[PDB]
């Protein structure tokens, strides 16, 4: 009962000002639940979705900004893809990107610019063992649409250079996902 | 945003018994309504699927007896398609088989015998005219999945041979559906 | 140390009558657990076939009536594939067939009739998250053949339509292994 | 129910000194039962591996030894094929090597010297007659795996050459069989 | 950020002696965990090597001797491959080689010889169940390099024959290991 | 034991606003130093990255700017490549751009521009003499990862043409390093 669809959910991300003369970098991790973008159901279904299981196969994170070109006090940073539910700790004004030498890095130009990221998570599995799988489409794990307690997906973390001014933006997490098991209830009346 | 899928329901049907010695027909009609399909859902959604509209392409009626093989006094009957919300009047004991001539019938073994009808039923857009149109999978129209209003599908109309037992059987309308357009929504919390 | 070879063990499975006029279902799941199909062995080997590990390929699940051609009241039910250890809830006389819009179903003609299901389960490896993996025979997991407390694999739930007669059954479940490792044991004397 | 597999067990062998000056060989013989590599079993299972029958095809005898490289008074001696249950007589010290000018043979170099000999047995049915048939692996006998009584396998005899040296060794008899007709039990409970 | 490498230890391994004349195995397993093997690094780096996960592809055990060609009283082991977390109970002086029949056996000649042996270890992701996948080098989970509790990889078990004499080793574990996501810092000064 | 990497570092580079009507030019050089990448490591490893050598490759100098589009003041400066130590000496206000006629120059379009300059630097061997080797990558020399006195590359410098404004800059200077002998470490405990 295979079903591929695509949901997405836009959120903010603010990024306060600063006082600090040097160039100063504000680290903040992603997780992705799909509790967040399916509402729970009525009646016999528990969810919205009539299916039993599910698998991400991609996520694309956007950057919407909410900045004006004309806006200055420009900068750099860095967004990478974290598999393990292990990041970098939150920061507000750290003197390096820890995020530059990452392998899956991809720069973030600021403050006015897009950055999306299209990449395929994982889940959160054993949080302290920390495995995954490689990506295989045909041998990925199927998981289930539990009721209340889906698992957390992950896999992105960024690098923010911090600014005189507020750099707010406005964060599109579409989420491509793959069903299985049509499992539509039916009661009378 | 085309999805296929399919959707079922159980439901009885009795044939009381009688004390006439003649072959006395008994005549009854079928309609095809989504809502007793579909349940209603939770919140921003309407109902369970999440889908705006939909078309009908086939139905499988099912004849699912109760009836044992060592009953007597079996029959005759007949099963025809009738698409458009004018069947033949329901009657008790009528003394013929109007269903007996049309071109769309297909012989009732009774009372212990399968019977099963797979058809494509057209929907009731004006029941003074009552037009529909051929079989076009391309240019079939798209209905609305509506939130309490769907309008009936139409299609089956059957006649009973009459016993001096009670036939009872239970009916399965299986009917294979086409929606469009994902409309899904997710309101944060 | 390949050997694949087949075990089987047969038991009983009763629906006790009703007096409800509706048509009335009665739901039940089934694990498979190879404990009840491997006794415990003997001195320095655990369990009779030596072998440390296993995976199981297919299951067979047989429901070989005990109700005669002759008895009335028959009805339709459902057999699905829920790989997942969370069934829907067991009932005696539930209002509808929950696993009759199931993609993995296959209708249970009743009462006297033969109705098997071959399928690949999948274990039980963390009940919370509850995760499986696809059909590939290559890269299907090794499971250790344990001493006392081998997993639960799983994979069918039923729905039997109630009647005035109590439906007896009886239930062999053909499973077929894959073993690896040959560790017999040869103390002296 | 085809299931080839191999079998071995370690056994000692020691060799006594001498103190007679001339080249004298001490002659023992090996036998070859199945009760000596699996042990009884449990249950309704009477042996450990589950299954019937039985055929040995090859066994390799290999004569581990005990003995150091800078060991005095070496010798010869000889390793024959003895199929018929009766061997040359058991001797201490023997003036002459009676498995020297056997067709089977192969000489065995010593005392720290690797030995192996790669053969088919043969059973024993009648030990009066000595019968056995040829070497044949379509046409081979079956035999039961019985509980308590599987008759011996035979075919091989050694002659050691003595010395004023104790020598010994570390015997390992690894047998290769096929069985047939996997008979395992599975009580309840 | 994919970087093949290679990893060493050497360690010791002593088997004392006995005054049993009969041929008494002494069995003793062996963990590989990847803490032994990478040093903790220093600062905003966790561990020496720069990176975040690893998958052990091969593992080259070797029992360098430390015993001279002219010591008697020679024997013979064996060593097989245990993927699960449960060997067989270390044991001092038992009376069978456990490890005689497994499919997984190589010979352990003693006390001078060499023995290597290579092949792919599988963690340990659930003591009670213990699954592990098969050897497939593009499905073949990524696992965390962690700073303090890396999970201890699995897959060899001993048996040597005791002597009356020392027999004491020297143990070399090579470590075939693949990386990714080279995770270096850099903070300024 | 050849692993090729990337190594990057952020450092800010300000231009003081003037007061003079001309246009007048700005020039600083600028070196690359290895212990500027990697950081001290831990115990018996001396760096973070367990190798003995090194030859940079290429490297990538990024001048990401803080000035705004709306900027006013423009001007037009250059960018050379230097590889022997000796740059044009460090001035604020020179009345002519030297870089303009050097046979690597690459434009600095200004004030909020992108510029990038990739190119292989040459190492300071004789500050004296001031040789260097042309890009051959087969013959290119390795130098020896040190512990403290890492030689500075060289190759860069720059005229930046001054303004009314304060231009600032944010400098991302990535490195293309390759490496070789993996010369890890592993005491016990």
């Not at 598999?83 to 970098?88: A, G, H, M, Q, W």
């Given at each position: 009962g295979i079903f591929n669809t695509r949901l997405s959910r836009t959120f903010g991300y603010t990024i306060k000002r600063t006082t600090v003369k040097t160039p100063s970098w504000a680290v903040d991790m992603m997780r992705f639940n799909i509790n967040d973008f399916l509402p729970p159901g009525g009646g016999s279904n528990p969810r919205s979705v009539p299916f039993e299981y599910y698998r991400i196969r991609k996520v694309k994170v956007e950057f919407w900004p909410c900045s004006p070109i004309t806006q200055g006090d420009r900068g750099v940073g860095s967004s990478a893809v974290i598999?393990?539910?292990?990041?970098?700790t939150k920061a507000t004004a750290l003197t390096y990107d820890p995020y530059v030498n990452y392998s899956s890095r991809h720069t973030i130009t600021q403050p006015f610019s897009y950055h999306s990221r299209y990449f395929t998570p994982k889940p959160v599995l054993d949080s302290t063992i920390d495995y995954f799988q490689p990506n295989n489409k045909r041998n990925q794990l199927w998981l289930r649409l539990q009721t209340a307690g889906n698992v957390d997906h992950v896999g992105l973390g960024t690098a923010f250079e911090n600014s005189i001014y507020d750099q707010e933006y406005n964060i599109r997490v579409t989420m491509y996902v793959q069903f299985r098991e049509f499992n539509l209830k039916d009661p009378p009346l």
């Open positions: 598999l393990d539910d292990n990041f970098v």
